[PDB]
Structure 1
Amino acid sequence: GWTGQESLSDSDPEMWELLQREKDRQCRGLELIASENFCSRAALEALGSCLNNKYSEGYPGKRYYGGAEVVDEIELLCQRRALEAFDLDPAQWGVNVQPYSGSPANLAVYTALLQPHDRIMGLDLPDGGHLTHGYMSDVKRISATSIFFESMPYKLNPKTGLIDYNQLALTARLFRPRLIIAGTSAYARLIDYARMREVCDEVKAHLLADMAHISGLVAGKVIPSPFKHADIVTTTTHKTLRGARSGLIFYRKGVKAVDPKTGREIPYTFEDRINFAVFPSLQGGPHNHAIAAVAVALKQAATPMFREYSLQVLKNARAMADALLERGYSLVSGGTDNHLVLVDLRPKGLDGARAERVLELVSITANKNTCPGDRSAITPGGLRLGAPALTSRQFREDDFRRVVDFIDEGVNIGLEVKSKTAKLQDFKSFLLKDSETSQRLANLRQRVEQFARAFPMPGFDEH
């Protein structure tokens, strides 16, 4: 008779088989999705805890709901570990740990700082921006950021460091936006630019750094911090931070600067505004399980171990980069200085959508990527590859050297099938039905999986 202390294995075999298939697919796969990581077991033990059951609407100091005695201390702990993880000064920075995920963390900042229809700029979606930074199609508002607010994108300058900081400054003086976002998905270069904070300081905009993709790197000081230049920072606690899926908003606090007469030094106004956008306005009850798992990860990230990881992540990225040039690929202007690598595949003779589907069938998971020349729409000429997921499975430069030989056999199987096919589902069908290709893919799949299965995997053994 139902106790609810039963195991998932006993009460829901259907779900336990599926957890187990997912676990096998991760262990046997080569995961190159720049935004994927494998979460620590420690973190998942918190994530899947009794903190699920506690409603704690409000914030630590006094948050009136009730018993929150212990969760208050978890939230403060998470706060302290957050500010420790990236460089201290609690005198000069605050943090909100309650955002449900990344998109909520951004919509919170917009909501706290701007009025509906206020003007926002971010790197356009195709040029490697996030959806939540704003995106309108020809005839549709697509991001909620573009619906509740007025978004104009700053494009990428095809071949250079790409982020046209020029065209930005030109258009940000014509558009008079009250917040500009500095953050990217598909970009191999450094930003979180002190020059964003000039373009901003100029036209009286707020600088928001969305560092979700590089947060681990920043956490580790293996790349330079947006927290010197930017006044608001948002991140996810997964990706390069390697925690559970949650979000963070960091904001400046205390006295901003001093000005005419004896002074009366002007105070920052973010803290209370961002905390009101998060709890009363947008979110109900925080997910205390996520907050705890986030706390576990942030401590992991404030350690010798995590600095070694993030250095290995850059060297692994460079390795995979150097390796692809060696066989003459083309990387979106140059190479990389971060966690990922954008391959241009038009000069090697294949698009992204074919390359992605071929690698998919050999247990290599990357994403197709629009290259500056946005024909776009599921047939872009690039491929986005990242090192963090595998670097967490103890891969080194030789391991990525070999990952790239497997991608090579993939690209090469593609070209071949691209020479007997009618572009669309006549390609995708041909990979299923053709006895010669179906076999050549199985053989490559089996080599990847044997290669993949041998490396350790964070998490539990079986789920």
Structure 2
Amino acid sequence: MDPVSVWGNTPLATVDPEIHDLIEKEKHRQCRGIELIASENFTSFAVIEALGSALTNKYSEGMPGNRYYGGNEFIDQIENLCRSRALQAFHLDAQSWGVNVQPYSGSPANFAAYTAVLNPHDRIMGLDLPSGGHLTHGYYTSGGKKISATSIYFESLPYKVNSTTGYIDYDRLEEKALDFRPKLIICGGSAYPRDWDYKRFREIADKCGALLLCDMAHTSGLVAAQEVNSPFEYCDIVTTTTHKSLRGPRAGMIFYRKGPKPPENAVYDFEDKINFAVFPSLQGGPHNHQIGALAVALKQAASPGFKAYAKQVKANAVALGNYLMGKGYSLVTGGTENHLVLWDLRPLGLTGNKVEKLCDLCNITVNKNAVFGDAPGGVRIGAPAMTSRGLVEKDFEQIGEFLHRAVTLTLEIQKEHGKLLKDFNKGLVNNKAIEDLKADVEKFSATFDMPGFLVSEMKYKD
């Protein structure tokens, strides 16, 4: 039996050189490309120190002051701190809003919210995936195969954007809701480049008797800084991830109205149902290292610096958008009001998969994305991650130039090898233009700061 220090106190670089080396290679990759995945970010070292800590050792099933085991003196304080900081970050009165901070991620947070307020097979609507919505808001194929757990255990129906403007068609949503009669309407999405008319959603929900939930995962950092419409003014429940624009660990939260209802002396009934759904119905012990790390992120999000970050994210998305748009490219809705742009590639005859593939070869990470609701004909581009490395508008205009080069090279490989993926991949090999672009992206990326670790100590600096 190994003495404690050999297995238990030796650092990772010695206990497991393989994993240490792979993480170091991943750190280097994060420092040598252009990260435009709109859901990604780079969190702080202080968050990561809480995440990688002894908090992982403690079981604390239940919730603070009402646990199933002992030894929770300090875990209770950490969870209570995290919860009160969550309410502060979003400027919520603790007598009108509560929050559960135990969900393991955003998707468990959504499914626990549904479990709390719906019965199995109850009806739900959310934004269609080709229109910018997320899997957890419901998804089934044309062949009827239920894919999302939301569509397996409840009855979902999507609403779409207008096929010519790309904005949410609020009239068709109201009509569909009166026909379908959902018990729950979901707003928020993954690839919608505009703000949300939450007042209109509330009017539609009240007209059809539905609860109204906003999944604010993508824009939660922007909501915290009061840079986009606040869903809390109008929604019954607000779910979120904590790792996207909020820049924290991977976790989820469920916010819920409490107290008297606005004008029978009726009161909200969400609190106990939401808490019970997370535990004991769906989850086990909370991940206390995530909760501690989340409390750190929420304190960082409440700071004047984070408000400046949120402004800069929106400004960088706009500058990138305008740059592409001055090159003659087409954006869905012709611009953005948030952290992302939707690049309609169809006027170029390119699929989003070809542009995504050549970009990845040049260390530019984007993702194909269906466009206007229609082989995805676009790509989604987000600003939070590279903004966190300190990039401002001119730097995002340089990102725009890099994207313009990558797309030109894609056209060039298509106009020489052909629109078939078996043919197109022939041009992606031994290609000096790709090799050059990659080199330029690498040298560009290396000039920027990186939160989360001591840069001078990284193993790979080439």
**Are 1:456 and 2:461 matched, yes or no?**
no
What is the correspondence of 1:68-79 to structure 2 with a 5 Å cutoff?
68-79=72-83
SS in 2 for 1:169: helix
- Structure 1 contact 417–427 (Cα < 8 Å) conserved: no
Contact 1:161/1:333 (8 A) holds in 2: yes
- Aligned counterpart in structure 1 of residue 416 of structure 2, from 414, 420, 432: 420
Identify the residue that residue 210 of structure 1 maps to in structure 2.
215
> How far, CA to CA, are the matches of 1:43 and 1:373 in structure 2?
37
SS at match of 1:399: helix
Matched position secondary structure for 2:131: coil
CA distance in 2, matches of 1:18, 1:393: 22
Counterpart of 1:208 in structure 2: which amino acid? Answer: L
CA contact (8 A) 1:100 1:247 kept: yes
What is the total number of aligned residue pairs between the two structures?
Answer: 451
> CA separation in 1, counterparts of 2:321 and 2:274?
39
Structure 2 residue matching 1:267: 3-state secondary structure: coil
Aligned partners of 1:192 and 1:217: how far apart in 2?
16
Shift of 1:459: 0.7
Amino acid at match of 1:105: A
Q: Does 1:151 align with 2:156?
A: yes
Question: What's 1:26 paired with?
Answer: 30
Q: How far does residue 383 in structure 1 lie from its aligned partner after superposition?
A: 0.9
Check conservation: 1:108, 1:282, Cα contact below 8 A.
Answer: yes
1:162-213 deviations in Å (ceiling 9; x for gaps): 2111110001001110000001111110015110011001111000000000
State how far apart, in whole Å, the 2-side matches of 1:44 and 1:428 are: 41
SS at match of 1:34: coil
Asked if structure 2 preserves the Cα contact closer than 8 Å seen for 1:161 and 1:189, the reply is no
State the partner residue of 2:400: 404
Q: Matched residues in 2 for 1:373 and 1:45: separation?
A: 42
1:48 aligns with 2:52: yes
The 3-state SS of whatever aligns with 1:126 is: helix
% of aligned pairs identical? 59
Give 1:458 shift: 0.9
User: In the aligned structure 1, how far is the partner of 2:55 from the partner of 2:25?
Assistant: 27
Residues 1:386 and 2:379 aligned together: no
Question: Is 1:430 matched with 2:435?
Answer: no
Q: Secondary structure at the match of 2:357?
A: helix
Unaligned runs of 5+ in 2: none
CA distances 1:308-355 after superposition (whole Å, capped 9, x unpaired): 000011110110011111101010011001000001112133221000
- 1:159·1:332 contact (CA, 8 Å) conserved in 2? no
Matching of residue 368 in structure 1 with residue 385 in structure 2? no
Q: Aligned letter for 2:416?
A: K
Residues in 2 aligned to 1:424 and 1:71: alpha-carbon distance in whole angstroms: 56
Shift of residue 426 of structure 1? Answer: 2.1
Alignment partner of 1:28: what SS?
coil
The residue number in structure 2 matching 1:270 is: 270
In the TM superposition, residue 231 of structure 1 has moved relative to its aligned partner by 1.0
Report the aligned-residue RMSD.
1.2
For 1:131, which of 110, 125, 135 is the aligned residue?
Answer: 135
The corresponding residue for 1:442 is: 435
The corresponding residue for 2:189 is 184
Are 2:194 and 1:201 equivalent residues in the alignment? no
Amino acid at match of 1:355: V
Q: For 1:398, give the aligned amino acid.
A: K
1:58-77 map, 5 Å:
58-77=62-81
Q: Letter of the aligned partner of 1:100 in structure 2?
A: Y
1:286 counterpart = 2:286? yes
* Contact 1:132–1:143 (CA under 8 A) maintained in structure 2: yes
Structure 1's 119 and 211: CA in aligned 2 closer, same or farther, altered over 3 A? same
- How do 1:60-139 residues align onto structure 2 when only pairs under 5 Å count? 60-139=64-143
1:209-288 to structure 2, matched below 5 A, reads 209-257=214-262, 259=264, 265-288=265-288
Give the TM-score, by structure 2 length. Answer: 0.96
- Check whether the contact 2:216–2:238 (CA below 8 A) recurs between aligned residues: yes
Counterparts of 2:421 and 2:344, CA distance in 1:
23
Check 1:133–1:12 CA distance in 2 against 1; reply closer, same or farther (3 A cut). Answer: same
Amino acid at match of 1:7: P
Q: Report how far residue 64 of structure 1 moved.
A: 2.2
Q: Give the C-alpha shift of residue 422 in structure 1.
A: 4.3
Cα offset, 1:49, TM superposition: 0.4
The normalised TM-score by structure 1 is 0.95
The offset of 1:160, in angstroms, is 2.6
Instruction: Spell out, residue by residue over 1:35-55, the C-alpha distance to the aligned partner (whole angstroms, 9 max, x if none).
Output: 100010000000000011100
Q: Is the 8 A contact 2:82 2:292 kept in 1?
A: yes
Q: Conserved in 1, the CA contact under 8 Å of 2:139 and 2:151?
A: yes
Instruction: Report the Cα distance in structure 2 between the residues aligned to 1:48 and 1:65, rounded to whole angstroms.
Output: 23
